[PDB]
């Protein structure tokens, strides 16, 4: 399920300012992390990343590839492949508390300057 820029802007409302990250920063980051696809999957032979935020099964959620994951977000990773971002966002907030925005490498490289392109508001 591929979202669009101003759709994502609307659905990430609850992240506004949390951890000091603006909505433009999040719209920019998720564009460059998953292409706005809530069903994106990127997988090695040692880890899998899931959904709009590309949350990994090494420490954040558990799945079949790593049943022994620390599962810090306490949730099955496949809950990050549906169209309800509510539980995705709760897990994102936990990632922010523990390791900060730089879990998402796209943020520093591509989404910390020129945020005009990512606004869907006055
Ligand atoms: Ca979900």
Numbering used by the authors: 1 to 122
Paper text:
The structure was determined via molecular replacement to 2.2 Å resolution with a final refined Rwork and Rfree of 0.20 and 0.24, respectively. Comparing shorter 15 min equilibrations that did not produce visible cracks with longer (40 or 45 min) equilibrations that also did not crack showed the same mosaicity (within uncertainties). For the lysozyme and thermolysin crystals, just a 5 min gradient was sufficient to prevent visible cracking, while α-lactalbumin benefitted from more gradual treatments. Using this cover, we performed 3 h gradient equilibrations of α-lactalbumin to the 25% glycerol solution. These crystals showed some surface degradation, but yielded mosaicities similar to the shorter equilibrations (0.54–0.57°).
